[PDB]
């Protein structure tokens, strides 16, 4: 919207919002990231520290495809399966337990949080944190490794 643009409002002022003394001409400092070490170090440092140098090993032909492991928390561990399932499976029937298979839900590694109630479940996954493993052992469930 050029009618809401500032340019239509500044018609009449001589220097047009950029001063009579300073005279913004073309490029007074440089272009882009010019002078990262020489004369703009108080802006490259003090606003982006760490920008200059090498940091570690150089993994040639790295893919974001072998390290694929979406993590699931113990808060999210219940709601991968519906609440009707856990209620009608642990409504005082027997010592059975429903299986929450996170691989079908699309998650690989089960990590540990709070809020894991008394009703025990069996979790099938590829990786586990020992926090979540202790939480499942404390609530009385089981831990199954699949692949």
């Amino acid at each position: 919207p050029s009618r809401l643009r500032k340019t239509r409002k500044l018609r009449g002022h001589v220097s047009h919002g950029h001063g009579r003394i300073g005279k913004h001409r073309k490029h007074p400092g440089g272009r882009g990231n010019a002078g990262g070490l020489h004369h703009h170090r108080i802006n490259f440092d003090k606003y982006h520290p760490g920008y200059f140098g090498k940091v570690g090993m150089k993994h040639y032909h790295l893919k974001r495809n072998q390290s694929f492991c979406p993590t699931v928390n113990l808060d999210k561990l219940w709601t991968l399966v519906s609440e009707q399932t856990r209620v009608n499976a642990a409504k005082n029937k027997t010592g059975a337990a429903p299986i929450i298979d996170v691989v079908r839900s699309g998650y690989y590694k089960v990590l540990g949080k709070g809020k894991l109630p008394k009703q025990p479940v069996i979790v099938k996954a590829k990786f586990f944190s020992r926090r979540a493993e202790e939480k499942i052992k404390s609530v009385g469930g089981a831990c199954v490794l699949v692949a």
Partner: protein, 187 residues
């Protein structure tokens, strides 16, 4: 002139709500009338929070809205929120509590109606409590916004814990000079 003091003419305030929502303007009219005709500072604060913006009305969560009622003294009071109350995927048990908010999400309304609670809007809140008796006025996590974690006196000079802007959080992006003592300096 006359006044040797500086001129700060308009203080800070937003009187008219900038939103063009007709329903919000009707609630603004109703609670402005109640705020100037009831001497109820509850209606004063609810009128100011209706004037308040979209970002500064953060979404309440269902577990927080439970835990602020779980405190002793909030048995039959109604939780009033100027803002949205959303679902929480975490909790499993929901009490029989009463809600008075704007734009409660669908799963939250469904779980409150399954648990047996009563959701309202501000017109029924005004019909049930003009002075706002029996209400607990709640607010949400303003500082929990991701925008507020980039804000501080610096991004790195007394290490500052304040999250500089970068594309990809990982190796080779802003980790060498000023982030470790082996390459130059260390903050």
């Amino acid at each position: 002139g006359v006044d040797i003091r500086h001129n700060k003419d308009r203080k800070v305030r937003r009187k008219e709500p900038k939103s063009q929502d007709i329903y919000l303007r009707l609630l603004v009219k109703l609670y402005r009338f109640l705020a100037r005709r009831t001497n109820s500072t509850f209606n004063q604060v609810v009128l100011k929070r209706l004037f308040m913006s979209r970002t500064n009305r953060p979404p309440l969560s269902l577990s927080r809205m439970i835990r602020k009622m779980k405190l002793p003294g909030r048995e039959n009071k109604t939780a009033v929120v100027v803002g949205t109350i959303t679902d929480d995927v975490r909790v499993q048990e929901v009490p029989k509590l009463k809600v008075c908010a704007l734009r409660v999400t669908s799963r939250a309304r469904s779980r409150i109606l399954r648990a047996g609670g009563k959701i309202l809007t501000f017109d029924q809140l005004a019909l049930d409590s003009p002075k706002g008796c029996g209400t607990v006025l709640l607010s949400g996590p303003r500082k929990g916004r991701e925008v507020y974690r980039h804000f501080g006196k610096a991004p790195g000079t007394p290490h500052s814990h304040t999250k500089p802007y970068v594309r990809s959080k990982g190796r080779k992006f802003e980790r060498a000079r000023g982030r470790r003592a082996s390459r130059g300096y260390k903050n």
